[PDB]
A paper describes a structure:
Staphylococcus aureus FakB1 is a prototypical bacterial FA transfer protein that binds palmitate within a narrow, buried tunnel. Here, we use a combination of X-ray crystallography, NMR spectroscopy, MD simulations, site-directed mutagenesis, and functional biochemical assays to characterize the membrane-bound conformation of FakB. This study focuses on FakB1, an FA transfer protein from S. aureus that binds palmitic acid (16:0) before presenting it to FakA for phosphorylation and exchange with the membrane. The bacterial class of FA transfer proteins is called FakB, and the bound acyl chains are completely enclosed within the protein interior. The open conformation arises from a conformational change in the dynamic region that rotates helix α8 outward to uncover the FA-binding tunnel and reorganizes the adjacent α8-β9 loop into a new amphipathic helix.
The rotation of the dynamic Arg173 residue away from the protein is predicted to expose and promote the opening of a portal to the buried FA. We determined the X-ray structure of FakB1(R173A) to determine if this was the case, but its overall structure was identical to that of FakB1 (RMSD = 0.210 Å). The hydrophobic interface and the Ser171-His270 interaction are apparently sufficient to maintain the connection between the dynamic region and the body of FakB1 even though the absence of Arg173 does expose the first eight carbons of the FA to solvent as predicted. FakB1(R173A) is a few degrees less stable than FakB1 consistent with the loss of the hydrogen bond connection to Ile94, and as expected, FakB1(R173A) was catalytically inactive. Although the removal of Arg173 is not sufficient to generate the open conformation in the crystal lattice, its disengagement is essential for the conformation change to occur. We propose that Arg173 acts as a molecular latch that must be opened to allow the exit of the FA from the closed conformation. Arg173 covers the bound FA and provides a key hydrogen bond connection with the body of the protein.
Residue numbers in the entry: 1 to 288
């Protein structure tokens, strides 16, 4: 037994962690209305991506890692001599990345692939990667790891706001919002993940109150957990995420782990400007 853990690029792990644990990444891509396209990487400058989004008449589209792209990486990892690969994927509710990971797996002989649907995205998805690597070091077997991650998924979630619903709406990434259309009476939309899909949760009158709602909803859930990791995941409005992070640092006991991350271009292409998420995991995830 030699277990490897990999993921797709939308887990948005820090390059320090990718380098420390030698995490292989199957990248997603984004394409703009002028045909411009690029692979997701920590080498991309996120501020320029938002600038290009803003100066686009048409919202940009994204692509899962082609089914051939995973095969290459398992084959790569096969040829390195690993016997089992745990694969943490973007939510199957919003992306074909998970299925293409599963279908690619069935195609590579000589290694056992265990694809796992995180049912979330960004560093909340990344937390499953970090949990899986920790368990491998602890001597756990692949089925024990998948079982543990499944349990973790029962106590993981996220709420989120965006400036305008158009990107989520036009890209088909929001569910159940066919009535919120029609000049959504100003009132900021608060959304949440449910069973891997993004659904409306509440409509609040201001963006500051949307941020307060993010905090209230998540704190009321995680007060019942034995272990708590919170992630503020910010889009392009710096003060948005700084405010929420500072507030959580003040309001939460130090027994809660409170961390900060950002959206990369694939997720940002569907959120648009002003994205801000607050996610939670009922575990003390190893962030180092
Ligand atoms: C605190 C966590 C916040 C998480 C917010 C995630 C927002 C996801 C928006 C939809 C992204 C869809 C990407 C699909 C990629 C593809 O397969 O083309």
């Amino acid at each position: 037994m030699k277990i490897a853990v990999m993921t797709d690029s939308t887990s948005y792990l820090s390059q320090d962690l990718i380098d420390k644990y030698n995490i292989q990444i199957a990248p997603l891509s984004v394409t703009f209305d002028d045909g411009k396209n690029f692979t997701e990487s920590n080498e991309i400058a996120i501020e320029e991506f938002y600038n290009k989004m803003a100066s686009s008449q048409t919202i940009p589209t994204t692509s899962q890692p082609a089914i051939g792209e995973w095969i290459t990486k398992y084959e790569m990892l096969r040829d390195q001599g690993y016997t089992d690969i745990i694969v943490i994927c973007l939510s199957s509710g919003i992306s074909g990345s998970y299925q293409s990971s599963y279908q690619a797996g069935e195609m590579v002989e000589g290694v056992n692939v265990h694809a796992f649907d995180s049912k979330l995205a960004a560093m909340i998805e990344g937390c499953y990667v970090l949990r899986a690597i920790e368990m491998v070091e602890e001597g756990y077997e692949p089925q024990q790891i998948i079982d543990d991650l499944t349990n973790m998924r029962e106590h993981t979630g996220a709420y989120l706001i965006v400036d305008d619903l158009k990107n989520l709406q036009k890209s088909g990434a929001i569910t159940g919002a066919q009535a919120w259309v029609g000049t959504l009476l100003k009132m900021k939309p608060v959304l949440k993940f449910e069973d891997g899909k993004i659904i409306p949760e509440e409509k609040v009158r201001t963006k500051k109150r949307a941020i307060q709602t993010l905090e209230k909803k998540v704190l009321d859930i995680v007060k019942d957990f034995e272990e708590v990791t919170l992630f503020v995941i910010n889009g392009d409005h710096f003060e948005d995420g700084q405010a929420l992070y500072k507030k959580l640092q003040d309001d939460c006991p130090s027994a809660y782990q409170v961390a900060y991350s950002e959206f990369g271009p694939v997720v940002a292409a569907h959120l648009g400007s002003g994205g801000l998420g607050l996610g939670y995991v009922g575990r003390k995830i190893r962030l180092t």
